[PDB]
Design a protein around this nucleic acid. Structure first.
Lengths: 106, 103
DNA sequence: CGGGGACCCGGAAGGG
DNA sequence: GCCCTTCCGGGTCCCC
């Protein structure tokens, strides 16, 4: 549980109400949208000591997850990605339950 | 020799992890120090504060990030413990409280 | 129409 | 090896 990973950082953001303006759940299971990708990459960059971080590069992080049962793209939807890995075991809640607590307008 | 947490920046955080904690401590070596969060049940959960050797300040402080709890579903604030621990050494410190919050 | 400019895709190199 | 970070060449859009 050392240096936090990209998928782990995004999950952290996804569970903070004060971050909903730039990253948020779409309301469909574990699908999520980087509504403001420049912001998300700026914070990821900050946490990992990488000033020059941008969405182009952060996205390559996301593409290395595609064969690894972590995160997939949602084809056709701008900035929309889906957790395919076992989040219900990780964070106790179902998606519907989490969406309720975090006031997700689907 | 012996490991001491003198004082901490804060003793509560979100269950989600990521909270930045300034720990003040007695002499440590940047490359032989770990911050272990734990729970001492049969469940026996453990995790490590996220930091690097550069975040260790003049041998006497650590600036680190809390790990997530093993679950987010809690409806009353939970309390876990933490200690300093040498990677190679075994020896640990007197263990301070830390408290995880919902939402 | 023709171009730039976003998202995207993955290969390749390299770091820590 | 792992997990990105940094590039890049290539693909599809849309819009000026």
């Amino acid at each position: 549980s050392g240096p936090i990973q990209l998928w782990q950082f995004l999950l952290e953001l996804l569970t903070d109400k004060s971050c909903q303006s730039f990253i948020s759940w779409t309301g469909d299971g574990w699908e999520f949208k980087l509504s403001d990708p420049d912001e998300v990459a700026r914070r990821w960059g900050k946490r990992k000591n990488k000033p020059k971080m941008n969405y182009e590069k952060l996205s390559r992080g996301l593409r290395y997850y595609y064969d690894k049962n972590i995160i997939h793209k949602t084809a056709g939807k701008r900035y929309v990605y889906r957790f395919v890995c076992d989040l219900q075991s990780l964070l106790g809640y179902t998606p519907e339950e989490l969406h309720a607590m975090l006031d997700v307008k689907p | 020799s012996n490991l001491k947490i003198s004082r901490m920046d804060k003793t509560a955080g979100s269950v989600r992890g990521g909270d930045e904690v300034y720990l003040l401590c007695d002499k440590v070596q940047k490359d032989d120090i770990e911050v272990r969060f734990y729970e001492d049940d049969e469940n026996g959960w453990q995790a490590f504060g996220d930091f690097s050797p550069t975040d260790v300040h003049k041998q006497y402080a650590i600036v680190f990030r809390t790990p997530p709890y093993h679950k987010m579903k809690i409806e009353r604030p939970v309390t876990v413990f933490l200690q300093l621990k040498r990677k190679r050494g075994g020896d640990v410190s007197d263990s301070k409280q830390f408290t995880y919050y919902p939402l």
